[PDB]
Amino acid sequence: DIIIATKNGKVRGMQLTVFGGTVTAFLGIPYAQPPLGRLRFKKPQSLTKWSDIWNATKYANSCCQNIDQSFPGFHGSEMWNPNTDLSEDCLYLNVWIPAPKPKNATVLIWIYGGGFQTGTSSLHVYDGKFLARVERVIVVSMNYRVGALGFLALPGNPEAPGNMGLFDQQLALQWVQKNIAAFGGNPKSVTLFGESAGAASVSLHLLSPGSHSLFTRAILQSGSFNAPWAVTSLYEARNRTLNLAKLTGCSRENETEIIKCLRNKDPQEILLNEAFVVPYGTPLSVNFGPTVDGDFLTDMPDILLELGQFKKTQILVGVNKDEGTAFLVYGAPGFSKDNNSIITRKEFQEGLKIFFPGVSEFGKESILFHYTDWVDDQRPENYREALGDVVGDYNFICPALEFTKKFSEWGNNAFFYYFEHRSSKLPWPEWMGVMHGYEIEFVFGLPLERRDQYTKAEEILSRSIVKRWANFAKYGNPQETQNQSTSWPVFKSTEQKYLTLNTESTRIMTKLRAQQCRFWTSFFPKV
Amino acid sequence: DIIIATKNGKVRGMQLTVFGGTVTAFLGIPYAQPPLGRLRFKKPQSLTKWSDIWNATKYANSCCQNIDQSFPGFHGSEMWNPNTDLSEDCLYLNVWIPAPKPKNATVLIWIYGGGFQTGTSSLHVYDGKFLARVERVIVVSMNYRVGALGFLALPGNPEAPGNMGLFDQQLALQWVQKNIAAFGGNPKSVTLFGESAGAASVSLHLLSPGSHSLFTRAILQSGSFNAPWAVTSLYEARNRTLNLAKLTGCSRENETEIIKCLRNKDPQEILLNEAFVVPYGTPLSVNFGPTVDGDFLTDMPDILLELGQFKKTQILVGVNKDEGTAFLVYGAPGFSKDNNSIITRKEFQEGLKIFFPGVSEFGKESILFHYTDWVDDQRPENYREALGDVVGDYNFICPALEFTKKFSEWGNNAFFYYFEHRSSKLPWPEWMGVMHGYEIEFVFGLPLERRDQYTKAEEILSRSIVKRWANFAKYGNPQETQNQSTSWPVFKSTEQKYLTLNTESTRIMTKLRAQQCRFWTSFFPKV
Numbered sequence A, B: 001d002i003i004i005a006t007k008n009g010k011v012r013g014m015q016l017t018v019f020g021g022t023v024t025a026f027l028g029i030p031y032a033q034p035p036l037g038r039l040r041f042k043k044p045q046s047l048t049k050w051s052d053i054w055n056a057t058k059y060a061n062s063c064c065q066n067i068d069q070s071f072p073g074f075h076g077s078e079m080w081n082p083n084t085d086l087s088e089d090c091l092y093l094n095v096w097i098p099a100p101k102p103k104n105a106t107v108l109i110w111i112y113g114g115g116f117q118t119g120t121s122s123l124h125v126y127d128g129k130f131l132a133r134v135e136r137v138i139v140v141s142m143n144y145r146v147g148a149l150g151f152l153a154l155p156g157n158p159e160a161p162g163n164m165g166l167f168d169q170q171l172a173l174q175w176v177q178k179n180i181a182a183f184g185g186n187p188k189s190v191t192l193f194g195e196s197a198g199a200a201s202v203s204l205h206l207l208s209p210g211s212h213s214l215f216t217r218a219i220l221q222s223g224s225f226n227a228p229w230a231v232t233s234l235y236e237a238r239n240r241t242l243n244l245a246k247l248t249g250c251s252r253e254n255e256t257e258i259i260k261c262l263r264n265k266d267p268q269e270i271l272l273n274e275a276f277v278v279p280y281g282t283p284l285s286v287n288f289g290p291t292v293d294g295d296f297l298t299d300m301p302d303i304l305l306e307l308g309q310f311k312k313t314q315i316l317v318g319v320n321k322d323e324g325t326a327f328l329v330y331g332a333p334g335f336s337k338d339n340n341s342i343i344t345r346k347e348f349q350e351g352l353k354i355f356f357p358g359v360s361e362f363g364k365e366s367i368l369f370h371y372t373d374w375v376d377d378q379r380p381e382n383y384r385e386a387l388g389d390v391v392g393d394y395n396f397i398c399p400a401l402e403f404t405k406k407f408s409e410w411g412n413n414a415f416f417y418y419f420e421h422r423s424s425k426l427p428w429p430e431w432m433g434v435m436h437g438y439e440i441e442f443v444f445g446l447p448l449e450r451r452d453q454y455t456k457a458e459e460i461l462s463r464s465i466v467k468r469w470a471n472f473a474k475y476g477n478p479q480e481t482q483n484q485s486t487s488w489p490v491f492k493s494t495e496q497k498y499l500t501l502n503t504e505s506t507r508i509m510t511k512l513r514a515q516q517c518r519f520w521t522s523f524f525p526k527v
């Protein structure tokens, strides 16, 4: 029976057998006041204190959110849907510790993605027990509010200031500063990691001055805040908040009154109207996301990055070979998970209109021109592959490389990876390749479980990535030093070396997507 | 009717239609006295002069040689067998010129491989008409003597001094110096190129002082003289010459008498006994090859390379992804062109004994140890693939990279390629991958012929390689400057950049086979 005294009271954990050893898991520890009633849309308030033993022995409620119903019964989509009850009462976190209790263990804090609209820390692919067993690190993950409930903004107004879910993440970081030594963690050795919006979130903590002292370093998987979906303009945030009001019958003249009305709405009515606050979305829409609130974020983040205003520390950044494919089967015409999706030029053109709705005709033609010069055989898959690369390059890969360059120019070591292994268990079809989100299970060490039907080469790839991540967190250097592995060189401006992660042979390469990213980075923003 | 006046007399050529234009071909021009009777085994003697028009309108006799009969009727082997009559009377060369007659064209001189035992300039894959049409270069190729007739050595004795076939190559280089301006060529812009033993030959012309002024630069495809098959020791040459005598009933006490006896033998009896001059050969045996004769080669060539004694000029060097596979089906147990050749550990072990017959048990185990640490799934093809890599790394790839490093250390620009495209027409089975010899058709531009059933991507790869080779010959820089191509960086000590040649995307990579070549280059020579 394992009980830990925290600043707010006692917590009971549970023991787990993992690989012939034990991990102690504390699932569902609260770290804030439930944000209900008058607290809805406000910054998380600090926890009152309890007396008695809080039983942290099951995952807590996931935050309210819309759910992906495009492929019911299909594991490829459903694995990402929440696996605990939805409730506004969702501000909880999990702690996995090695057994016996470590003395001063490095801490890995996971921030999930989901577009800032969805996600929960209790998914199977985020289970931190394998990392605690194998690397003897402590792993922490928190639920944070998503959608309008997490990111509604009327900026400057403390009834709905914006970025509440980023403040939920920050308050969990603070909980780890105050409490983790009780669990055997070193509050001075904390690495944030996250994927997609969780990676964009990690990048914004590098920018936020109230996060500077809450962590040591950062890992960004397929996301960074300069991605075109990651930050909402003040203009679009106000418009969306008042669009939400209009839809829920909460248009008022005093803005504090709009929010008060919005506080009387059933959470379902808020969720049901979120999709419509925008005149046309895309599969990549982030209707309620981070804004420049003057609090968490003091200025436009592109300006902070460019002018070197961020935490000086090491970063590890990477992307997957086919980031954009997952999004094509949520509305691009001629695409389907259930066939090979050989599409025509006309379909490609229609697909750009689906992904680039506010963009001028010239803008869309410039994309077509950059991506359709083949290269050369015709090649029925030409247009199918180009559309996935358009979406992946624009939304994930070029912003990650641009973030990595600008960050490294200010003197800190940066390491960049390109993940190019397709999981042998992937339920999505082959044409979708190495999809967005499908390195995560390798990072959390799921293929280390021999009972799970991953191949032996995958068990080895995962073990090595697990070691590199842990070495990054502990030592700021993502090497695998014992097995004659390829040395991972720092990513510098000028050379731009990156490491490929694959089952066959790790390679050092240079200037990932050089020609494509010149297009998105220097020309497209003008269009 | 196109007639050219040469230093030795008139030659009539023939016109060819190639790609809606014309090439003039002069096939079978003699460049030496036929080396018959008293001239057999001696250095080529210079040509007497003729009066009348020598008709250069068909390929000439190929030199006497044994023929590959392992797969009769099979195009994969038979494409390399000679396609003109065999005769000692074989010292002829071909000239392809653009039409109209160029004014001062760069000259490309092809030296074929065949292990120094076989080969002829008239094979289809060496037809220089496409390069003359497309790049407006002049292409020259010569027949040179092979086997004992080309390389028998009793060194110091001018009746059989050694290296006669390298002297045949040199005398053809001289013919081009004296005659090529008459054809519209620039004798001051001559690039040698060659594959396998033709590449080892090209590398020896960089070392030979009598070749220094006969050419400007050099291209080495899958060969260099530091490869373990390329140069025969004085010891093994004498032993083989006297072994040949013993077998033909020509053992005598006066050595000039051995040679005189050998001059009375039918060329068939010499050919029939060549295989047996060695106690055990391998599929890679070069029984009669280059020696240090004190004439063509003044010292052991490893010493010249190491100490910088060679022509200072630019080089282009490369290898194919699966150099060693071709040799496995000529005697390694469990291999077959007609199945997938999944072999066992025992078979691998037997295969090393086939490829490394004089090598100690410890030597062979060290090879097994370096190549059988997987990497990791088992992977039935593990041993099959390892044996191909052992043979390809030892015999071709590590010596080429070692040659390229040592050459570039003396200040000259070097460019290195790794050819990794498997021809869509390859008659050999898939497991053999990107075989030895199968870049040649890409270099000579055979896929430019749309009538030939190569894919469109192959036509493009060939066009680009043809342009890089021609730019190398003309300008010393193998760039393709007009089509947004990957820039080919010089290969330097320290970084060791190389360019990959493939149908998909050209990449700049570093330190090809670093771990393998450390084994062959620094450790294996001690064994």
Ligand SMILES: *[C@@H]1O[C@H](CO[C@H]2O[C@@H](C)[C@@H](O)[C@@H](O)[C@@H]2O)[C@@H](O[C@@H]2O[C@H](CO)[C@@H](O)[C@H](O)[C@H]2NC(C)=O)[C@H](O)[C@H]1NC(C)=O
Residues within 6 Å of the ligand: A332, A333, A334, A335, A336, A338, A339, A340, A341, A342
């Ligand atoms: C791959 O499937 C798509 C997607 O839509 C389809 O899903 C299929 C597996 C099948 O059940 C089909 O009946 C279903 O509608 C096909 O595109 C669709 O095809 C029709 C015309 O035949 C269009 O009018 C539809 O609008 C279009 N749907 C979408 C969303 O674009 C697609 O052609 C198919 N591709 C193949 C077989 O190569």
Ligand SMILES: *[C@@H]1O[C@H](CO[C@H]2O[C@@H](C)[C@@H](O)[C@@H](O)[C@@H]2O)[C@@H](O[C@@H]2O[C@H](CO)[C@@H](O)[C@H](O)[C@H]2NC(C)=O)[C@H](O)[C@H]1NC(C)=O
Residues within 6 Å of the ligand: B332, B333, B334, B335, B336, B338, B339, B340, B341, B342
């Ligand atoms: C692939 O074939 C080899 C090569 O020899 C064979 O060629 C085959 C296609 C077939 O015609 C066969 O009859 C012929 O001998 C096979 O290895 C051979 O197999 C026998 C025992 O079955 C040995 O005793 C032979 O010595 C051996 N030959 C050599 C040269 O090693 C091989 O097993 C086969 N591999 C497969 C099917 O996976």
Ligand SMILES: *[C@H]1O[C@H](CO[C@H]2O[C@@H](C)[C@@H](O)[C@@H](O)[C@@H]2O)[C@@H](O[C@@H]2O[C@H](CO)[C@@H](O)[C@H](O)[C@H]2NC(C)=O)[C@H](O)[C@H]1NC(C)=O
Residues within 6 Å of the ligand: A236, A239, A240, A242, A243, A244, A246, A247, A276, A277, A278, A279
């Ligand atoms: C933000 O403000 C308006 C609001 O329009 C919206 O009304 C909402 C409550 C919601 O239901 C939403 O779907 C609807 O679009 C946007 O105006 C839209 O623009 C179109 C033309 O593009 C006009 O027809 C309407 O005013 C309205 N659309 C529809 C379909 O009725 C406006 O575009 C937006 N501002 C932005 C995006 O910067």
Ligand SMILES: *[C@H]1O[C@H](CO[C@H]2O[C@@H](C)[C@@H](O)[C@@H](O)[C@@H]2O)[C@@H](O[C@@H]2O[C@H](CO)[C@@H](O)[C@H](O)[C@H]2NC(C)=O)[C@H](O)[C@H]1NC(C)=O
Residues within 6 Å of the ligand: B236, B239, B240, B242, B243, B244, B246, B247, B276, B277, B278, B279
């Ligand atoms: C060079 O000299 C001898 C010559 O032996 C050879 O006789 C030739 C005419 C020819 O037929 C050839 O096959 C034969 O090998 C080599 O001696 C051989 O070595 C073995 C033991 O390895 C002895 O049994 C014999 O002397 C002879 N072999 C056979 C099978 O009869 C000698 O090895 C070689 N020198 C080298 C390789 O450096």
Ligand SMILES: *[C@@H]1O[C@H](CO)[C@@H](O)[C@H](O)[C@H]1NC(C)=O
Residues within 6 Å of the ligand: A012, A055
């Ligand atoms: C916590 O769990 C233990 C079960 O072993 C129990 O004794 C205690 O009452 C629990 N607290 C609850 C249910 O609030």
Ligand SMILES: *[C@@H]1O[C@H](CO)[C@@H](O)[C@H](O)[C@H]1NC(C)=O
Residues within 6 Å of the ligand: A103, A104, A186, A188, A189
């Ligand atoms: C943990 O390590 C830090 C340095 O990273 C040190 O300052 C701290 O006191 C240590 N605490 C322990 C061993 O309890």
Ligand SMILES: *[C@@H]1O[C@H](CO)[C@@H](O)[C@H](O)[C@H]1NC(C)=O
Residues within 6 Å of the ligand: A254, A256, A257
């Ligand atoms: C609006 O109403 C709120 C709350 O009832 C009040 O506190 C605030 O001062 C009012 N402001 C304006 C501008 O009407």
Ligand SMILES: *[C@@H]1O[C@H](CO)[C@@H](O)[C@H](O)[C@H]1NC(C)=O
Residues within 6 Å of the ligand: A463, A464, A467, A480, A482, A483
């Ligand atoms: C290193 O190699 C061993 C044994 O060869 C292997 O079992 C282990 O997984 C490897 N460790 C890492 C961190 O990759």
Ligand SMILES: *[C@@H]1O[C@H](CO)[C@@H](O)[C@H](O)[C@H]1NC(C)=O
Residues within 6 Å of the ligand: B012, B055
């Ligand atoms: C060379 O060819 C032409 C054929 O057009 C002929 O007139 C001449 O006699 C030939 N020379 C020979 C056969 O020696």
Ligand SMILES: *[C@@H]1O[C@H](CO)[C@@H](O)[C@H](O)[C@H]1NC(C)=O
Residues within 6 Å of the ligand: B103, B104, B186, B188, B189
């Ligand atoms: C050919 O070019 C060379 C320089 O490479 C020059 O010296 C020579 O005279 C030229 N000859 C011509 C145009 O006939």
Ligand SMILES: *[C@@H]1O[C@H](CO)[C@@H](O)[C@H](O)[C@H]1NC(C)=O
Residues within 6 Å of the ligand: B254, B256, B257
């Ligand atoms: C051997 O005979 C040759 C040719 O008949 C002769 O010229 C030579 O001087 C002789 N040398 C010896 C050492 O017997």
Ligand SMILES: *[C@@H]1O[C@H](CO)[C@@H](O)[C@H](O)[C@H]1NC(C)=O
Residues within 6 Å of the ligand: B463, B464, B467, B480, B482, B483
């Ligand atoms: C360059 O591109 C053109 C037209 O796009 C093509 O037809 C030609 O083959 C290319 N040239 C080379 C040297 O690759």
Ligand SMILES: *[P@@](C)(=O)OCC(C)C
Residues within 6 Å of the ligand: A113, A114, A115, A116, A195, A196, A197, A198, A229, A283, A284, A285, A286, A395
């Ligand atoms: P990630 C799956 O959180 O990506 C955000 C999406 C909206 C581009």
Ligand SMILES: *[P@@](C)(=O)OCC(C)C
Residues within 6 Å of the ligand: B113, B114, B115, B116, B195, B196, B197, B198, B229, B283, B284, B285, B286, B395
């Ligand atoms: P190239 C085919 O001439 O290779 C020589 C062989 C004997 C290694």
Ligand SMILES: [Br-]
Residues within 6 Å of the ligand: none
């Ligand atoms: Br069009």
Ligand SMILES: [Br-]
Residues within 6 Å of the ligand: none
């Ligand atoms: Br053994």
